[PDB]
Amino acid sequence: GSSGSSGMELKVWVDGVQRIVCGVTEVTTCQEVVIALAQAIGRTGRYTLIEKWRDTERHLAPHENPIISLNKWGQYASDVQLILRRTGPSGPSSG
Template identity: 60%
Template sequence: MEVKVSVDGIPRVVCGVTEETTCQEVVIALAQALGQSGRYTLREKFKDFERCMTPNEHLLETLEKYGEQAREVQLTLLHNGPSVWDEMSRTKVGRYQPCPPFQ
């Protein structure tokens, strides 16, 4: 299945998402495809409800809870800055981080 995720305001499509795919796997795939290292959060937004998804959460399972309104859910990849490993070793690996405060 394909899932749309907004990255820096640009919609990106993640292909091959299955029932077993975790949010962390989606974050890593996007970070690697973009060639960006650092700490990331995947944010889910539906109408007035907004939250950061957990790394081990199964993305499709969460979206299925919305039923027919699942298409209205907006997913956004947030880049929270460099990871400790990036600063130490300069490797390009996506790291999942807790949600930053909402502004």
């Protein structure tokens, strides 16, 4: 399938614990990330990537890039945090 040595660490809150993700790059869109995590933790389904800042929650698109979505802020990019939320329940897995 796909593979890439060079990657970036994306800080995203997963189950209360911020889990790092290696491999994600400017190119890698949000859809590729939101799924990567769900697959890493196990269970799979429909997840999303929300950014929390100064008490502001905003949903992102599956076509929008995670690294880029942040770059925007730049100076105040770090302050912004990521939270993987579920927008839909899981289905029949393992048969």
